[PDB]
Coordinates of C-alpha atoms and ligand atoms in Angstrom, one line a residue:
X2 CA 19.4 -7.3 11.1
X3 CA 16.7 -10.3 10.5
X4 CA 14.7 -10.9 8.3
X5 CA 11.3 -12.6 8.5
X6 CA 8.8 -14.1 6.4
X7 CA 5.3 -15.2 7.2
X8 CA 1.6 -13.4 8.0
X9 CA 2.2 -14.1 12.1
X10 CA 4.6 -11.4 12.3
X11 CA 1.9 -9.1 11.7
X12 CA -0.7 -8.1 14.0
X13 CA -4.1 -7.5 11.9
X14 CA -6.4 -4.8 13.2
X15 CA -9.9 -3.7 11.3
X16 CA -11.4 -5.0 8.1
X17 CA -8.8 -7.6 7.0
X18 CA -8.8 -11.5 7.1
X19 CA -7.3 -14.9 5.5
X20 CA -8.8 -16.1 2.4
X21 CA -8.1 -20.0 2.0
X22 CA -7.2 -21.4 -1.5
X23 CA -8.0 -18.5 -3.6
X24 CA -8.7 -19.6 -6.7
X25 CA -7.8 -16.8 -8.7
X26 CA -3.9 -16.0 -7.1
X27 CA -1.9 -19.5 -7.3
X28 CA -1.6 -19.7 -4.0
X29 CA -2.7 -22.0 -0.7
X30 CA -3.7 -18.7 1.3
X31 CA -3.6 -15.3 1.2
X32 CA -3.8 -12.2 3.5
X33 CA -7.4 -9.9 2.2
X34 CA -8.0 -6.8 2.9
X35 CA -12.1 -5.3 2.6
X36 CA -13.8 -8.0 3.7
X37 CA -17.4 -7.3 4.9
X38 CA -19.9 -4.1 4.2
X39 CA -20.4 -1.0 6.5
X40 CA -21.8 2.4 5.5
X41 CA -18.8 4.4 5.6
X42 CA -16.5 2.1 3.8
X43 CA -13.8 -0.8 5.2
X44 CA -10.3 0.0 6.8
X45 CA -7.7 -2.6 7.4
X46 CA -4.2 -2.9 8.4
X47 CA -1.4 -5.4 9.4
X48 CA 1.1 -4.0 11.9
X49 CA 4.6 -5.0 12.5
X50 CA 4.9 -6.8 15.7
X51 CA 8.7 -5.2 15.7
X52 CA 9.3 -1.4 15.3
X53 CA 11.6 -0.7 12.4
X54 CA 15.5 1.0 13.7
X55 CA 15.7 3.6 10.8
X56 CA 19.4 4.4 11.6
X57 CA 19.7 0.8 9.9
X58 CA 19.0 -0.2 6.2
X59 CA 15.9 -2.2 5.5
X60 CA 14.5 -4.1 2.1
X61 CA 11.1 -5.5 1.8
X62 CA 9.5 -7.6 -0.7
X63 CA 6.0 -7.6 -0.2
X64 CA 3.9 -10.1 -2.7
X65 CA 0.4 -8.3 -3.1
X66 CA -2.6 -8.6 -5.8
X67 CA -5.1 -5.7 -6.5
X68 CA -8.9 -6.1 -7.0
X69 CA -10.0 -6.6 -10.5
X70 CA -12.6 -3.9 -10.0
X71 CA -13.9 -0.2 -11.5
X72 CA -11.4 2.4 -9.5
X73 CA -15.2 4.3 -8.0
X74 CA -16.0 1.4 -6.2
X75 CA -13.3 -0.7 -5.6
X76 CA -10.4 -0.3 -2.7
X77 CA -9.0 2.5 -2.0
X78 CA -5.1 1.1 -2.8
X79 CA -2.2 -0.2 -0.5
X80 CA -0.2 2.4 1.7
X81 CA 2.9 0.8 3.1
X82 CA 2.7 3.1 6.4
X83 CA 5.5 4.4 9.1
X84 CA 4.3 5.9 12.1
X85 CA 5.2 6.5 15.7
X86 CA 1.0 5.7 15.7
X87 CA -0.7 2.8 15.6
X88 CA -2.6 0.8 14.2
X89 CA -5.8 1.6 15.9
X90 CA -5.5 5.6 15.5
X91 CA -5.1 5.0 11.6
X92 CA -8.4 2.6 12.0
X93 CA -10.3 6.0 12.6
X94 CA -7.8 8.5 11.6
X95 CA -6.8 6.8 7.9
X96 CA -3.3 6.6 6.6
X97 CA -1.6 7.5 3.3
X98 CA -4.7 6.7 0.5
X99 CA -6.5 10.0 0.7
X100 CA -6.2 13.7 1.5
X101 CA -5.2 13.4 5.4
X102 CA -4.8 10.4 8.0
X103 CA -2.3 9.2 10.9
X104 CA -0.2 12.4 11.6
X105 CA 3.4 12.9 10.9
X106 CA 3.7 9.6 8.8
X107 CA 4.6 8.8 5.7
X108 CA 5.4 5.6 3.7
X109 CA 4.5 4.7 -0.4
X110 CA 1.1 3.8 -1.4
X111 CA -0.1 1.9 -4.9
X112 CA -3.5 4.0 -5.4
X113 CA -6.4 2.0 -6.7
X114 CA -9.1 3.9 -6.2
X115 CA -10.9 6.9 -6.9
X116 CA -11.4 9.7 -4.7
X117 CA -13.4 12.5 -7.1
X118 CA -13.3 15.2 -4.5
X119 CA -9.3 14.8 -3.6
X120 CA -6.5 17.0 -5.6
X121 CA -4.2 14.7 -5.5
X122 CA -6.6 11.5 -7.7
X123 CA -7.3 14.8 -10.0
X124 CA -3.8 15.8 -10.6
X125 CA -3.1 12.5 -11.2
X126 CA -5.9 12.2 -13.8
X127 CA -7.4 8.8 -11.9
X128 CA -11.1 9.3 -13.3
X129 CA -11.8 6.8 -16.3
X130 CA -13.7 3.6 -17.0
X131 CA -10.0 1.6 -17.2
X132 CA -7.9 0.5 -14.0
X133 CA -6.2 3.7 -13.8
X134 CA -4.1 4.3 -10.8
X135 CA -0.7 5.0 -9.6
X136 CA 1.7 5.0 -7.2
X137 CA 3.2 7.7 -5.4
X138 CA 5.6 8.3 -1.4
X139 CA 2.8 10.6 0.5
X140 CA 3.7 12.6 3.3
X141 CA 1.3 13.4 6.7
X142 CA 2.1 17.0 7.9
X143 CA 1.4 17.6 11.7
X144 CA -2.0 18.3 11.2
X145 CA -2.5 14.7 9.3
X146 CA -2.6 16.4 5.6
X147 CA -1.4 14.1 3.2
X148 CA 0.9 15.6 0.1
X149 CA 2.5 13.7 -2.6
X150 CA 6.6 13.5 -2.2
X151 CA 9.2 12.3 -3.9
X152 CA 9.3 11.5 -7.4
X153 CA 9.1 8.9 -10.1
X154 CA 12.9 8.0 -11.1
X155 CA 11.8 6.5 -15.2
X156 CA 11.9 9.0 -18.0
X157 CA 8.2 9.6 -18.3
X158 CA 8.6 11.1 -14.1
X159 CA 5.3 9.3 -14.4
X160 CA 3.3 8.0 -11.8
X161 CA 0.6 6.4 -13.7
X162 CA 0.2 2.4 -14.0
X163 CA -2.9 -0.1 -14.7
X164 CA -3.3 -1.8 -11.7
X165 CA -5.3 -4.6 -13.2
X166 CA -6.0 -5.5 -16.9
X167 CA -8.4 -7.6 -19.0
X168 CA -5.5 -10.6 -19.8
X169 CA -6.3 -14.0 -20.9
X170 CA -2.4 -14.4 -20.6
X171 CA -1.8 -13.1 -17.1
X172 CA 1.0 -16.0 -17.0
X173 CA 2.7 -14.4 -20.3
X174 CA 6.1 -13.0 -18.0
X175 CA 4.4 -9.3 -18.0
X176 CA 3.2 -7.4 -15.0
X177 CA -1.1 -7.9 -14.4
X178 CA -1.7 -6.3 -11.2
X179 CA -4.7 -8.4 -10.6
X180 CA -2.2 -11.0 -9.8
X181 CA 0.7 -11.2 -7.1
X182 CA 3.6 -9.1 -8.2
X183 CA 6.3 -7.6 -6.3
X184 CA 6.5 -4.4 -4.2
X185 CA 9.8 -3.5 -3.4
X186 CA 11.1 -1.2 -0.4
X187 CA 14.6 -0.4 0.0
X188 CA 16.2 2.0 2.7
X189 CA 19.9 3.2 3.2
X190 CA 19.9 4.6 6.7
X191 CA 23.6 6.0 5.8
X192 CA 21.9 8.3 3.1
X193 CA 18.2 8.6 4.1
X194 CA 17.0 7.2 0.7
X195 CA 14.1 5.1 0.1
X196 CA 13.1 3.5 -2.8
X197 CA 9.9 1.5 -4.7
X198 CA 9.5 -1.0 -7.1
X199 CA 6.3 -1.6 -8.6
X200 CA 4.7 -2.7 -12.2
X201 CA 7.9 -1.5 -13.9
X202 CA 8.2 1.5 -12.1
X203 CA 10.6 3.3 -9.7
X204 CA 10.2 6.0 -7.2
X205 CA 12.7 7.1 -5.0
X206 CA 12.4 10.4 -1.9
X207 CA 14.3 10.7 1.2
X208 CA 13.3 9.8 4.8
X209 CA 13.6 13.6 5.8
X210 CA 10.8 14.6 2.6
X211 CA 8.6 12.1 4.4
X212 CA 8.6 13.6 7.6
X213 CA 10.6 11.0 8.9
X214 CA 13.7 10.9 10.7
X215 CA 16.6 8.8 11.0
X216 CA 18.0 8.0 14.9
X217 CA 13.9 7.0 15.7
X218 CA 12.3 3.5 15.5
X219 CA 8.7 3.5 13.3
X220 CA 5.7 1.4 13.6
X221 CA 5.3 -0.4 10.2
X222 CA 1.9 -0.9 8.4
X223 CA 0.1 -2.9 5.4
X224 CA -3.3 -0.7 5.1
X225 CA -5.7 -1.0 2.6
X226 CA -9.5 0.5 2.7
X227 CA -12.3 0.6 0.7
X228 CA -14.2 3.7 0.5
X229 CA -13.6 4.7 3.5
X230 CA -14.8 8.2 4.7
X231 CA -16.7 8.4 1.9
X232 CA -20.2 7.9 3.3
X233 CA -21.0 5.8 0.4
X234 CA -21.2 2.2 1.4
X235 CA -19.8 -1.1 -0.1
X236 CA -21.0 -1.8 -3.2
X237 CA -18.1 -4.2 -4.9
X238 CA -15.7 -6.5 -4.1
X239 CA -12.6 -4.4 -3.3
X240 CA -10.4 -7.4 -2.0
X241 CA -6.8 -6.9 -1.7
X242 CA -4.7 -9.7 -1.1
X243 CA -1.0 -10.1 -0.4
X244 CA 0.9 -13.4 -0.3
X245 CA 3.4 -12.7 3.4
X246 CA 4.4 -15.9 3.0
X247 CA 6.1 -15.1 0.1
X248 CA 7.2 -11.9 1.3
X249 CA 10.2 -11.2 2.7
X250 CA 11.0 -8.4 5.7
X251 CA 15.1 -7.4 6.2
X252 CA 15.4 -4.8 8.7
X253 CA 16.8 -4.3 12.4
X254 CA 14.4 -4.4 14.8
X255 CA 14.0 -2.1 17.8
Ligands
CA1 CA1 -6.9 7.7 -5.1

């Protein structure tokens, strides 16, 4: 096993780029997601230079900050992505934020964005004027449909959470999702289970519900997008920014 820190062990493909100095994050730089303006939305990922051995545990830490933005045009969320694909097919194809995307893949996104026409945003009652989102592990069948798996693990079995707030005390010790806060990602190859951490919250499935298996090595991607599909331009700022130097990567590679 190894474990890595740092933005250079990421290869970055599509609408993504380094903001310097960001004065709203506390930090020197950052890694943003949704930078420019095209008429079908923005679409952005970091891939693992090293594929992922999933018959070996892995943890992740991954430092990331969510747009302080209205959920109809701001990004679409983060979808932390496994894939024999790459990152290029899931540039055109999308991942894990809406109804289908890179085919038999699966991983856990944080869903920031509003989709009115998908079942999955409706289910999950995303339409409102607040930050509403939530987080959720999303499966890609074989024809690239995406469905909800897994569960949420707290006593609600909620998957709802604010991913931003209105705080003039974002430095008060409780989670604001407009600043950096940690994602967590465990795996235990012995037992197939995979866990996240986010905003308070815990989800847990099992490689095998995400269409995943374990004697295989995965492609592993940061995506974000903005709209994207949609046919309905860029009309916010939908930046999502993670800190990688302040991640933290553990896995063997292969
Ligand atoms: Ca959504």
């Amino acid at each position: 096993p190894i474990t890595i820190q740092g933005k250079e062990h990421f290869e970055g493909y599509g609408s993504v780029d380094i903001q310097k100095k960001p004065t709203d994050l506390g930090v020197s730089e950052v890694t943003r997601f949704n930078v420019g303006n095209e008429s079908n939305g923005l679409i952005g990922a970091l891939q693992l230079k090293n594929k992922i051995d999933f018959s070996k545990d892995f943890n992740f830490k991954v430092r990331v900050a969510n747009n302080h933005q209205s959920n109809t045009t701001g990004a679409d969320g983060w979808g932390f992505l496994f894939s024999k694909g790459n990152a290029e097919e899931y540039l055109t194809n999308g991942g894990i934020l809406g109804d289908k995307g890179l085919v038999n893949s699966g991983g856990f996104k944080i869903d920031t964005g509003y989709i009115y026409t998908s079942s999955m945003d409706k289910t999950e009652k995303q339409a409102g004027q607040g930050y509403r989102g939530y987080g959720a592990f999303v499966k890609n069948d074989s024809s690239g449909n995406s469905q909800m798996v897994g569960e949420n693990i707290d006593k609600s079995k909620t998957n709802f959470l604010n991913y931003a707030d209105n705080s003039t005390n974002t430095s008060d010790g409780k989670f604001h999702g407009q600043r950096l806060n940690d994602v967590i990602l465990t795996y235990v190859a012995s037992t197939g289970k995979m866990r996240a951490e986010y905003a308070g919250k815990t989800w847990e499935t099992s490689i095998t519900d995400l269409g995943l298996s374990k004697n295989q090595a995965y492609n592993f991607l940061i995506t974000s997008s903005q709209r994207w599909g949609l046919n309905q331009g860029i009309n916010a700022n939908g930046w999502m920014r993670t800190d990688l130097k302040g991640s933290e990567f553990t896995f063997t590679p292969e």
